[PDB]
């Protein structure tokens, strides 16, 4: 298909409220559950926050993840596949700490059948996936002081690099006042940015590495 | 198909001489070129060493790579795709140091059309790719003295983890009197291990993370 000029998955009810990770480096877990939440809405018609804490506590060493000390969205997806489920956030709440794995199938709210990693740096392929599949988990370079101070508009930081450090969720794309953007859901609470979102420059040379390592899950 | 019990791509004429990276952390570049060397043989009938130095010098910041301070096989493949080529090793020989990008299309020896990332941690899927596609680029946990000290046989390190740090090339698989292994080409020269190779434990719980992050390229 010709792709739409703009997408916002919040308009189809596929995006949960913004979460607050606190001082725990669980962005990877928030990114992964956010991508799966959309697929769960598309499959079942029902929007349910999924347990980032379940990923922190249970998608650990075997998956190359370190809980509050960082991890991968892809290996989080593979945990959910291998585990045959993930609990709801309501059942397995977020504590911003490394804990023992408390997964229980009686609280399962989603499954995952597979995941797809997109080709490195390809903003056109990322656009196609956001339009045709759903929100996409990505990493960005969030190290620069400007990122923390973002309030509005389209974020463009000349000091940005493709050395990504922060897992976030692309929930859309568009153009604002002549600037193309990616709509990014962060996990630093509503105080960050525009109610927890940042519009990041799109088609500006893989700005901040946004299209470096994109992935999305699917449900059978 | 039912997969063969053992495979060795050296018998198929798809593996070049073992290289010596020296003090430059270019293992990712050697892994990537070795994977592509096999596909180039399968396509063209020619066995040619490809330029690891081209990747060190040219698949840099924009690809998330740091030359002699490490990088990704996947993003190296994407550089080859984006660049529409990689030079021969003969034309662009290995220096064991970071240099300005000297790529010249007049010395192009290969192209790449795509690469594939295998699902996390699946040794069965890795076996299928090695049997049916070609040598597979992987990362392993080489953070143990036993790896440096390896001489012969099937390598098993009880303290191994899935926190991989060394890029290598799976060029086959088999068993040593029933002890299953992956046949791995390293880039530590011909004095390392079994004349440049290490046989690493297979079907032992993703030992040393060998099946954590596998990828292979293809040519049009
Ligand atoms: C959040 N509070 C802390 N950040 C992380 O945990 C971070 C997430 S990420 O999205 O930046 N990211 C995962 C994708 N990843 C990658 C790199 C190369 C190939 C494939 N995938 C980049 C990092 N995770 C980490 O920083 C852990 C890590 C770093 C790297 C370089 N690999 O994994
Ligand atoms: C070689 N002499 C030095 N080591 C590296 O260059 C190393 C190679 S790796 O095999 O450990 N590896 C590349 C594969 N990579 C990955 C993760 C996810 C998807 C695809 N590929 C993991 C690392 N590279 C690094 O150490 C650089 C790096 C990247 C990441 C995320 N962590 O480390």
Judge: B206–A62 Cβ closer than 8 Å, yes or no: yes
Torsion (CA) A169, A102, A116, B180 in degrees, nearest 10: 150
Q: How far is CA B74 from CA B29, B59, B63, in A?
A: 10, 11, 9
Residue with tokens 């349910």: A48
Residue with tokens 């240099």: B99
Q: In whole angstroms, what is the distance from residue B35 CA to residue B73 CA?
A: 9
Q: Which residues are paired to B116 by β-bridges? A: B216
Q: In whole angstroms, what is the distance from residue B60 CA to residue A173 CA?
A: 28
What resolution does the deposited structure have, in angstroms?
1.3
What does DSSP assign to residue B11? T
Q: In whole angstroms, what is the distance from residue A187 CA to residue A192 CA?
A: 9
β B166-176/B136-140 pair status: antiparallel
CB A215 within 8 A of CB A74: yes
Q: In whole angstroms, what is the distance from residue B33 CA to residue B85 CA?
A: 12
Q: In whole angstroms, what is the distance from residue A142 CA to residue A210 CA?
A: 10
CB B28 within 8 A of CB B70: yes
Q: In whole angstroms, what is the distance from residue B21 CA to residue B10 CA?
A: 20
Q: What are phi and psi of A181, to 5 degrees?
A: -145, 160
State whether residue B55 sits within 8 Å of chain A by CB: no
Q: What are phi and psi of A188, to 5 degrees?
A: -110, 25
Chain A: give the shortest CA distance to residue B217, in Å: 12
Q: In whole angstroms, what is the distance from residue B186 CA to residue B204 CA?
A: 20
β A179-185/A215-218 pair status: unpaired
For B15-128, where are the E strands, in sequence order? 86-87, 108-110, 114-117
- Sign of the C-alpha dihedral computed for residues B130, B133, B135 and B141 taken in this order: negative
Upper half-sphere CA count for residue B67 (Cβ side, 13 Å)? 16
CB B35 within 8 A of CB B16: no
Q: In whole angstroms, what is the distance from residue B209 CA to residue B200 CA?
A: 11
Closest residue by Cα to residue B210 from B154, B168, B157: B168
Closest residue by Cα to residue B20 from B89, B87, B91: B89
Determination method here? X-ray
CB pairs under 8 A between A and B: 54
**Helix and strand tally (H, E) in chain B?**
5, 10
Q: How far is CA B67 from CA A211, B82, B142, in A?
A: 21, 18, 19
Closest residue by Cα to residue B168 from B130, B205, B119: B130
Chain A: give the shortest CA distance to residue B195, in Å: 30
Nearest CA to ligand 1 atom 20: A213
**In chain A, residues 72-91 whose CB comes closer than 8 Å to chain B:** 74-75, 78, 82
Pocket residues: Cβ below 6 A from ligand 1: A 25, 27-28, 70-73, 139, 164-167, 213; B 72
CB A139 within 8 A of CB A33: no
User: How far is CA A145 from its chain centroid?
Assistant: 21
SS3 call for B91: coil
Candidate of A21, A34, A139 to mutate for ligand 1, largest count of ligand atoms within 8 Å of Cβ: A139
Q: In angstroms, what is the C-alpha Rg of chain B? A: 16
CB B97 within 8 A of CB B24: yes
Residue B125 Cα to ligand 2 middle (Å): 20
Q: Which residues are paired to B136 by β-bridges? A: B170
What does DSSP assign to residue B67? T
Least CB–CB distance from B78: residue in A115, A120, A164: A120
CB A186 within 8 A of CB A20: no
Nearest CA to ligand 2 atom 5: B70
User: How far is CA A181 from its chain centroid?
Assistant: 16
Q: Which atom of ligand 2 is nearest to the CA of B165?
A: 11
Residue B139 Cα to ligand 2 middle (Å): 6
SS3 call for B199: strand
Q: In whole angstroms, what is the distance from residue B36 CA to residue B44 CA?
A: 12
Residue A167 Cα to ligand 1 middle (Å): 7
User: How far is CA B165 from its chain centroid?
Assistant: 13
Chain A: give the shortest CA distance to residue B11, in Å: 32
Tokens found for residue A188: 């630093």
SS3 call for A14: coil
Closest residue by Cα to residue B165 from B34, B57, B69: B69
SS3 call for B52: helix
**Distance, first Cα to last Cα, chain A:** 23
Minimum Cα–Cα distance from B62: chain A residue: A162
Least CB–CB distance from B74: residue in A64, A120, A164: A120
Interface test with B, best of A112, A117, A208 (most B CBs within 10 A): A117
User: What length is written for chain A?
Assistant: 220
Minimum Cα–Cα distance from B213: chain A residue: A75
Q: In whole angstroms, what is the distance from residue B198 CA to residue A80 CA?
A: 32
Q: In angstroms, what is the C-alpha Rg of chain A? A: 16
Upper half-sphere CA count for residue A153 (Cβ side, 13 Å)? 10
What does DSSP assign to residue A44? H
Residues 6+ apart with CB under 8 A from A158: none
User: How far is CA B39 from its chain centroid?
Assistant: 12
Q: In whole angstroms, what is the distance from residue B166 CA to residue B26 CA?
A: 9
State whether residue B51 sits within 8 Å of chain A by CB: no
State whether residue A215 sits within 8 Å of chain B by CB: no
Pocket residues: Cβ below 6 A from ligand 2: B 25, 27-28, 70-74, 139, 164-167, 213
Q: In whole angstroms, what is the distance from residue B4 CA to residue B181 CA?
A: 14
Q: In whole angstroms, what is the distance from residue A203 CA to residue A201 CA?
A: 7
Q: In whole angstroms, what is the distance from residue B107 CA to residue B118 CA?
A: 31
For chain A, where are the E strands, in sequence order? 7-8, 86-87, 108-110, 114-117, 136-140, 154-155, 166-176, 179-185, 197-201, 215-218
Q: Which domains does chain B have, with CATH numbers?
A: 18-218 (3.90.70.10)
Among all residues of A, which ones are annotated catalytic? Answer: 27, 166, 186
CB A73 within 8 A of CB A63: no
């Amino acid at each position: 298909r010709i792709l739409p000029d703009s997408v916002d998955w919040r308009e189809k009810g596929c995006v949960t409220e913004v979460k607050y990770q606190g001082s725990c480096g669980a962005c990877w877990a928030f990114s992964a559950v956010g991508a799966l939440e959309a697929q769960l809405k598309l499959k079942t018609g029902k929007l349910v926050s999924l347990s980032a804490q379940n990923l922190v506590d249970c998608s650990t060493e075997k998956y190359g993840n370190k809980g509050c000390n960082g991890g991968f969205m892809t290996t989080a997806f593979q945990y959910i596949i291998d585990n045959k489920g993930i609990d709801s956030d309501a059942s397995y709440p977020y504590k911003a700490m490394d804990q023992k794995c408390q997964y229980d199938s009686k609280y399962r709210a989603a499954t995952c059948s597979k995941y797809t990693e997109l080709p490195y740096g390809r903003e056109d392929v990322l656009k196609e996936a956001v339009a045709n599949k759903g929100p996409v988990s990505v990493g960005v370079d969030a190290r620069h002081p400007s990122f923390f101070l973002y309030r509005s508009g389209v974020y463009y930081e000349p000091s940005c690099t493709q050395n990504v450090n922060h897992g976030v969720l692309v929930v859309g794309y568009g153009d604002l006042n002549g600037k193309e953007y990616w709509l990014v859901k962060n996990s630093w609470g509503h105080n960050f940015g525009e109610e927890g979102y940042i519009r990041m420059a799109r088609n500006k040379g893989n700005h901040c590495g946004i299209a470096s390592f994109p992935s999305y899950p699917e449900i059978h």
